[PDB]
Amino acid sequence: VEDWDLVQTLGEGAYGEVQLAVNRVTEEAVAVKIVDMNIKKEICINKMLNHENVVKFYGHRREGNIQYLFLEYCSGGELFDRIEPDIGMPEPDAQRFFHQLMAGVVYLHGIGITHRDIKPENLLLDERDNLKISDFGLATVFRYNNRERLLNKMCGTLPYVAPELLKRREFHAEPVDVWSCGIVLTAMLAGELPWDQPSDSCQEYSDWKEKKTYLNPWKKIDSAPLALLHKILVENPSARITIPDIKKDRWYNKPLK
Ligand SMILES: CN(C)CC(C)(C)COc1ccc2[nH]c(-c3cc(NC(=O)c4cnn(Cc5ccccc5)c4)c[nH]c3=O)cc2c1
């Protein structure tokens, strides 16, 4: 029962690959992340995580240069692949995935962890299309012994990143994750990213601050989810909506399909 057949390749990453592995006896699947050993922290963070919208960590094995992490298998693949270019997806599915993303993110924040790289490539779908947050490689602790520390390393992926992280030496962790979730929502409902980065050097970002919502991607989005996006994609992180308030939003609580 301790033996696993590496069946299929799942994902190349920078540092590794991810293999479907199946158990010889039980036929259980796992995803196996394989790296030429950042990683100490990733394992350490994963060890603290236990939630239905976070990819389960099963364990690790040293093997000299090669680090193995054994991770929950999500047969649905990446949310990224459910987003049709230029269209997105049906609004009820976007809503359900967003509900689950917030559940995952609430959980992480409640234990003082920030993911710092939320995007569709990192949101996995299990067999019943349940969304799971993956890839704790950029994640870090922002609250410890009930004291918040401010972040100052710039980490993430530029189209998903909050504007305060390009402009401020220090910033709060939670609003940043909130922002990226908003860019994820936008992608789900429009099938495109609104900007390369949230700077006034990008015209699409200037246009959004000038409320030009008759332009794309905003014109493809119904008025109710767009009103939520108006509260999330707010340049000042202190005025940006918080998760407890997202859970009170009208579209968030709209019955759909
Ligand atoms: C492109 N596609 C049309 C090709 C096709 C093969 C159809 C992809 O379809 C699937 C289907 C199911 C999948 N499941 C997984 C998976 C991925 C992870 N990954 C992670 O948890 C993690 C942790 N860190 N990273 C990024 C990384 C990876 C390697 C090295 C460094 C960083 C990823 C954990 N569990 C999974 O189950 C990927 C995956 C892909």
Author numbering: 6 to 42, 51 to 270
Sentences reproduced from the published study:
Chk1 and Chk2 negatively regulate the Cdc25 family of phosphatases thereby preventing cell cycle progression as well as directly modulating repair proteins, resulting in increased lesion repair. Chk1 inhibition, therefore, represents a novel therapeutic strategy to increase the cytotoxicity of DNA-damaging chemotherapeutic drugs in p53 pathway defective cancers.
The X-ray structure of VER-154637 bound to the ATP-binding site of Chk1 showed that the two rings of the fragment were coplanar and made the expected hydrogen-bonds with the hinge motif of the kinase domain. Modeling suggested that an amide linker grafted on the pyridone position 5 would offer its carbonyl group as hydrogen-bond acceptor complementary to the hydrogen-bond donor character of the contacting water. It was then noted that reversing the intramolecular direction of the amide linker could maintain its hydrogen-bond with the conserved water, while also keeping the desired compound length for binding to Lys38. No attempt was made to design compounds which would be selective for Chk1 over Chk2.
